């Protein structure tokens, strides 16, 4: 489900680093910037492979100041929440609002009107969990979640999951 793409990022290098090691400076800048970025269009850039392969081009010096802009051409693993598929995740939190299922670097939220009526909130057990007949989900449990959220990609992406229909349980 993870995708390998050919994204590109523009870095405006300062003339103060216009030495023989500006290439490595751009390399470390790309690492420290792109990793952990929750871009709305793409998602999470988990890691960049072929570090000793990524190539830079001739940097265009802006008319305004001496800073040069470089258009790097890198490829990396991208994770997108997407919409309209099933996916397996592990719970990390629970409350009256719902359970915070975690899939990779994500936290998909399930609201009250999403899961079927076969789940009731209670705190009798050691972990606060939704307990009912033939359903047992806890703080740490297996759960299959179907995503139908609107993502709402604004400098960060999100996901909303559903528990309706069978196969969306522990199994």
């Amino acid at each position: 489900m993870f995708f390998i793409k050919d994204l590109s990022l523009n870095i405006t290098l300062h003339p103060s680093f216009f030495g023989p090691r500006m290439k490595q400076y751009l390399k470390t800048k790309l690492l420290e910037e792109v990793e952990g970025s929750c871009t709305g269009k793409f998602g999470y850039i988990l890691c960049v492979l072929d570090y000793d392969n990524i190539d830079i081009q001739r940097g265009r010096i802006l008319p305004t100041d001496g800073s040069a802009e470089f258009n790097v051409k890198y490829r990396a693993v991208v994770f997108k929440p997407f919409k309209g598929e099933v996916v397996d995740g592990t719970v990390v939190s629970c409350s009256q609002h719902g359970f915070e299922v975690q899939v990779g670097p994500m936290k998909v939220f399930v609201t009250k009107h999403l899961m079927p009526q076969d789940l009731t909130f209670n705190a009798g057990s050691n972990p606060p969990s939704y307990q009912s007949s033939e359903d047992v989900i806890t703080i740490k449990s297996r759960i299959r979640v179907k995503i139908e959220g609107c993502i709402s990609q604004v400098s960060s992406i999100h996901a909303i999951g559903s528990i309706k229909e069978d196969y969306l349980g522990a199994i």
Binding site: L31, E35, Y44, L46, G104, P105
Partner: peptide, 19 residues
Amino acid sequence: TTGGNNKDLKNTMQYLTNF
């Protein structure tokens, strides 16, 4: 290896390992 912070890398690696 990666350095920095990259907090999300641990969670996805754990998900890959346990699944």
